Amino acid sequence: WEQYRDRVNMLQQERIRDSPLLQAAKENDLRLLKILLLNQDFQQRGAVGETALHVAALYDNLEAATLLMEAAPELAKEPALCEPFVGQTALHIAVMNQNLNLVRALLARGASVSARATGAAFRRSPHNLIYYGEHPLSFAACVGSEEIVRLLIEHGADIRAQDSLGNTVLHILILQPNKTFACQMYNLLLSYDELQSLELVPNHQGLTPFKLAGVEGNTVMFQHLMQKRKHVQWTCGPLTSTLYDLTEIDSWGEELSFLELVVSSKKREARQILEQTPVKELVSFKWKKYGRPYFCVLASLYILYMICFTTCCIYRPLKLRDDNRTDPRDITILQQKLLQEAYVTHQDNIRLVGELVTVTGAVIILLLEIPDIFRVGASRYFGQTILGGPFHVIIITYASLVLLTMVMRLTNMNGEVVPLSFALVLGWCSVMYFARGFQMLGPFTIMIQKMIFGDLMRFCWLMAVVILGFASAFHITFQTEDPNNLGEFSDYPTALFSTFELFLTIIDGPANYSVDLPFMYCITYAAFAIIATLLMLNLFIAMMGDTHWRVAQERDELWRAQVVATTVMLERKMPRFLWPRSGICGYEYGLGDRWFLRVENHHD
Amino acid sequence: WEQYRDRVNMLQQERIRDSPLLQAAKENDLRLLKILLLNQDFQQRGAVGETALHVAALYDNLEAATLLMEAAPELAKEPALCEPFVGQTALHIAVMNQNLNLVRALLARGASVSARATGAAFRRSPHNLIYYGEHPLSFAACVGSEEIVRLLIEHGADIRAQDSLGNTVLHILILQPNKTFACQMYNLLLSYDELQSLELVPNHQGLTPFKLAGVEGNTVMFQHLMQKRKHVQWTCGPLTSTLYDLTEIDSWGEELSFLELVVSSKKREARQILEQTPVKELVSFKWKKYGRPYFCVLASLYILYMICFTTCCIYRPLKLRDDNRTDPRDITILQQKLLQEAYVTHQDNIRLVGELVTVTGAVIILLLEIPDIFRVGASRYFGQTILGGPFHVIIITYASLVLLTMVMRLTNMNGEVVPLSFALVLGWCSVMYFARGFQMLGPFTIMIQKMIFGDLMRFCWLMAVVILGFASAFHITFQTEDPNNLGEFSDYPTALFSTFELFLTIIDGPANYSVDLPFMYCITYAAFAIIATLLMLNLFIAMMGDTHWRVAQERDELWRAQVVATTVMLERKMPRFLWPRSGICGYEYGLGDRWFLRVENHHD
Ligand SMILES: CCCCCCCC(=O)OC[C@H](COP(=O)(O)O[C@@H]1[C@H](O)[C@H](O)[C@@H](OP(=O)(O)O)[C@H](OP(=O)(O)O)[C@H]1O)OC(=O)CCCCCCC
Ligand SMILES: CCCCCCCC(=O)OC[C@H](COP(=O)(O)O[C@@H]1[C@H](O)[C@H](O)[C@@H](OP(=O)(O)O)[C@H](OP(=O)(O)O)[C@H]1O)OC(=O)CCCCCCC
Ligand SMILES: CC(C)[C@@H](C)/C=C/[C@@H](C)[C@H]1CC[C@H]2C3=CC=C4C[C@@H](O)CC[C@]4(C)[C@H]3CC[C@]12C
Ligand SMILES: CC(C)[C@@H](C)/C=C/[C@@H](C)[C@H]1CC[C@H]2C3=CC=C4C[C@@H](O)CC[C@]4(C)[C@H]3CC[C@]12C
Ligand SMILES: CC(C)[C@@H](C)/C=C/[C@@H](C)[C@H]1CC[C@H]2C3=CC=C4C[C@@H](O)CC[C@]4(C)[C@H]3CC[C@]12C
Ligand SMILES: CC(C)[C@@H](C)/C=C/[C@@H](C)[C@H]1CC[C@H]2C3=CC=C4C[C@@H](O)CC[C@]4(C)[C@H]3CC[C@]12C
Secondary structure, eight states, X not given: OHHXXXXXXXXXXXXXXXXXXXXXXXXXXXXXXXXHHHOOOTTOOOTTOOOHHHHHHHTTOHHHHHHHHHSOGGGGGOOOEETTEESOOHHHHHHHTTOHHHHHHHHHHTOOTTOOOOSSSSSOXXXXXXXXXXXXXXXXXXXXXXXXXXXHHHTTOOTTOOOTTOOOHHHHHXXXXXXXXXXXXXXXXXXXXXXXXXXGOOOXXXXXXXXXXXXXXXXXXXXXXXXXXXXXXXXXXXXXXXXXXXTTTTOTXXXXXXXXXXXXXXXXXXXXXXXXXXXXXXXXXXIIIIIHHHXXXXXXXXXXHHHHHHHXXXXXXXXXXXXOOOSTTOOBOEEEOOTTXXXXXXXXXXXXXXXXXXXXXHHHHHXXXXXXXXXXXXXXXXXXXXXXXHHHHHHHHHHHHHHHHHHHHHTTOSOTHHHHHHHHHHHHHGGGGGGGGSTXXXXXXXXXXXXXXXXXXXXXHHHHHHHHHHHHHHHHHSTTSOTTTOOSSSSHHHHHHHHHHHHTTOSOOOOOTTSOOOHHHHHHHHHHIIIIIIIIHHHHHHHHXXXXXXXXXXXXXXXXXXXXXXXXXXXXXXXXXXXXXXXXXXXXXXXXXXXXXXXXXXXX | OHHHHHHHHHHHHHHHHHSHHHHHXXXXXXXXXXXXXXXXXXXXXXXTOOOHHHHHHXXXXXXXXXXXXXXXXXXXXXXXXXXXXXXXOHHHHHHHTTOHHHHHHHHHHTOOTTOOOOSSSSSOSSSSSOOOOSXXXXXXXXXXXXXXXXXXXXXXXXXXXXXXXXOOHXXXXXXXXXXXXXXXXXXXXXXXOOOOOGGGOOOSSOOOXXXXXXXXXXXXXXXXXXXXXXXXXXXXXXXXXXXXXXXXXXXXXXXXXXXXXXXXXXXXXXXXXXXXXXXXXXXXXXXXXIIHHHHHHHHHHHHHHHHHHHHHHHTOXXXXXXXXXXXXTOOOOEEEOOTTTSSOSHHHHHHHHHHHHHHHHHHXXXXXXXXXXXXXXXXHHTTOTTTTHHHHHHHHHHHHHHHHHHHHHHTTOSOTHHHHHHHHHXXXXXXXXXXXXXXXXXXXXXXXXXXXXXXXXXXXXXXXXXXXXXXXXXXXXXXXBXXXXXXXXXXXXXXXXXXXXXXXXXXXXXXXXXXXOOHHHHHHHXXXXXXXXXXXXXXXXXXXXXXXXXXXXXXXXXXXXXXXXXXXXXXXXXXXXXXXXXXXXXXXXXXXXXXXXXXXXXXX
């Protein structure tokens, strides 16, 4: 909340400028500070509970801080006592200002090296511009001063300490945007670290520093981590045979693997870690050997199942209508057969076998799609475009509509045409889910997805506004006319549908040249042809062209992300005997229990 | 196979780390090596059959290699004895690591300079990252160390030696990606070469180094080869008159010429050699003087032949139907005349003359197109887009359909409309083959080809999926309705055709405003108008626009490649008296039997 933080900062500045000691410490006024510290409070606090030493350390005044530490040195151990800054000692502010002399003086005076800055300003939030952690070692690692890190570690800072989110100092080091010096600081902290190692300590969410580097899109820290796990077997000429380790990449026998955390991430940059050196090799092996033929087999089985469903839909049992067509505008000549009237002939028995196959396929689809929602969460399963969220919504709706059609068929309920048409359209449009397995058809589904949940939802309000206005105009111009001669605008729903058809130029303009149409229709339809047909439609065509160009710029990255997501899904759902553990065995060749991957690269 | 090569490498590293001698040679451990070589095997081998000297040479340990060569020097002549590395001595690994001292020590010890590295890793394959050949001189030329080349040649390496593919050292030099230093290495090896020259030695495929440089897209080596064949007549001011040699470019009196090998190549870069200095001049002379008027004459003759075929198709003999139209939905009022009933009047005799002209043209087309398939191969004749593969398929199908129509006409078989329509469409669409002879119409055929075998085959699966789903929905919504009022969806093939028409907006939406259509048709057609008409169609429009832009970026190169392919085809197929040998005579002007080409260029 910005209006509370501004009030806190203004009250802090008012309390600094009101007290003479805080004002003398702020401006580095040595004379007034010496006068006030010669004789008379040393423990007066501002609006945020900060002492005079915090004010002296905030404005980088070393001499005023030494003068304030000459008398009553316990201010080195006094933390702030207010909500936006809880526990912020002078050491944190001295480290953040990167003043080595003030940090050395505070550690000589005996400041707490394990004091936690548990305020609201130090938490990880979009309100806070920086997440530097809570312990002063985290601040010293994130700022980028190695001397302060060595001085804090030699004075007894704990490298294994965790903040309120559970993040260790490596986790807060990974999250920094300055990823160049952060690798050197990571190497320094790993050198100073000698139970389990600091690399295997997870946070409260459950992520290791390797997995957190994978999630947050930190490619440089990912390369720095993987350069400590490779093993160059031989470098012969331009050929180099590296042996990468898949212990923290494959994550075999785990609830959530590394690649599933990488792909199902809100950060955009994480897909770049699907283009790194061991990960791309690993997913290419797992896709070309196992993922692609199993995905093609599943696609062929689903296509045959949809063909059986379509064949059961076309041969739906219909009989002659018993009631006579009294209304001249009624064209219903057939109605649905009853349950006793149907399933008599042998062709109806073949249809019954096909319908049993269809309903068992729908039950299998529901049993395969429902527990993943409870496992991974409803917001992430239906939300991610790469994972196939809309396809999961479509296939769950299709299975529910097939079950609803079964219920309506067993209970002799008329009106199966509506769920059968819904199920046919959704089930056939869910065949395009299996187009992600091919590079020639992969990004096209993403193009249609970004044109439907993108430009279509951003232009349908303007389209519906124009449709409503011109449909109302076309209805009231033809309210006083004979509906037989021009019945395109006779009822307001039919006027809305006719104008929606005329927007996309899929029907002709209504014209009857043997009768006198009203002139207001002519002027209003000229306006509709200019504004809606010509101008606003071809704006949407250009928006779709820009969306197609935007996806086609990054088609390979998006198809690779779809490949990794499909490979992770097929490794998780299919049984283990169809998916052996990828990589070299390792134990057979005299090495440990780790599973390795050999990459031969052509350098120089 | 990667899973075998990884197993071989891991077994090799395990056998290195198991034996103490191989481990001492790997780590350059002098103490353990001296202890093991003082007293006790010197001939122990690893998983790939490599000796200890191969391990010492693989890790660039010169001192350990000299210690291993001090005792039992026969390890300098010991090759590996396993399948992925056959015959790989220590000299090949010493040359690949570019260690001149180790190569000199191995040649002093008496290593085999003609040992062949006939393993699977040294062959030319997409599995292997490098193709450096088999003989150590090929390795020394490909790595780029002139001192090793001179040391191997002075010790007795054969420059004329060929590997399993028949490639000499020049062939393996051309295939390298580092084409800058490869020209200098080529010049050094030609200087050291003093029967026929090394430039005229072909491989097992039949290609000279000039032809292999032409095929593989190596433009820099092509310039380096052509700078040894030019002859500057006079340089006056800014004008330079060079006299290029067409002995290895024109290839007169040969089964496969140089330009036919350049154009009909799987490599993309070979078309750049159609833009070089003598080749572009030569094909421009051969096209502007001979190829263009002969191609225009053939185009005019084929257009007149297709006009005669169309005129015979329009005047096809038809008589009144003998059977009465019993079915009210039947509109057949004419049927085909019999063979005895036809060919009676004088106009039928004119039609008979035209049909004889048509069938002789089809026989001529078959006799001109069939033996080229057996000559150049079915995979290359119908495969290359530049050569006109689809046009050859179309014209062979057209000739076969004309012959089938002749067979059905002679045997009084009804149903000539189907092969006549097939032959008319294919024969008229084969007129666009003759559009490659004009720069204003050249790349347009390539645009249509890349939009048909490209984006159309990559989008027709999604299009057919949407067509099948919405056709099934529109059929089952109108299964219970009267087919007289709205017969666009009455049968499932007719529903498929009507939805395919509604996809491309070539017919209107089915609407009958005098009767009550079902509302599910209205919602499903609104969905079809949004998803299929508006979104997915204009995605294909944008894909075709991107394909058109991609071809229009490189229109001149593609048209030049079409010109060279057409010129080669017309030089091969037409008789020799219409195609004199291009270039200056040479023998008349006191020079040799070579045929030259004069190029005047404006330098500076
Ligand atoms: C029947 C289907 C139901 C699907 C329901 C669930 C649908 C579902 O799974 O995604 C919903 C969508 C997700 O976002 P969306 O599809 O727009 O795409 C993501 C993101 O929102 C941006 O739009 C994308 O970048 P840009 O802005 O294009 O540059 C970004 O690309 P990248 O940077 O990550 O690479 C994407 O990650 O959010 C909505 O807008 C709701 C519209 C709902 C409209 C329909 C409501 C029924
Ligand atoms: C009736 C006609 C029959 C023709 C049969 C034979 C047709 C025939 O001769 O070419 C077939 C085609 C060749 O490849 P295609 O036409 O796509 O074009 C080549 C290549 O495959 C790439 O597509 C092109 O680059 P890009 O990817 O565009 O960037 C490349 O350009 P360049 O880099 O070389 O400059 C081209 O050399 O391969 C198929 O995909 C089969 C589709 C068959 C579909 C239809 C099957 C009946
Ligand atoms: C049955 C009729 C009445 C209406 C409701 C039908 C709507 C269908 C055609 C629409 C609704 C949402 C659309 C839709 C949702 C999301 C996606 C995921 C995207 O990555 C590819 C396109 C795809 C798969 C499309 C396909 C067509 C769908 C499924
Ligand atoms: C992009 C915009 C323009 C799209 C979303 C607008 C949708 C509206 C205008 C369309 C979509 C489906 C149409 C529709 C659905 C079904 C029926 C029932 C039918 O008996 C009368 C027409 C009627 C009532 C029309 C009214 C207009 C609707 C609701
Ligand atoms: C007769 C009807 C029923 C159907 C089969 C006809 C198909 C024709 C129109 C289609 C089939 C394949 C198409 C086709 C094949 C390939 C090429 C080569 C390309 O470089 C230019 C376009 C061109 C020449 C086009 C022309 C139109 C063709 C020949
Ligand atoms: C790009 C996609 C959408 C293209 C290739 C799809 C093709 C399908 C949908 C089209 C192409 C030709 C069409 C076609 C050919 C001929 C006939 C015979 C006629 O008596 C009934 C319609 C029927 C049976 C239709 C069915 C639908 C077909 C097969």
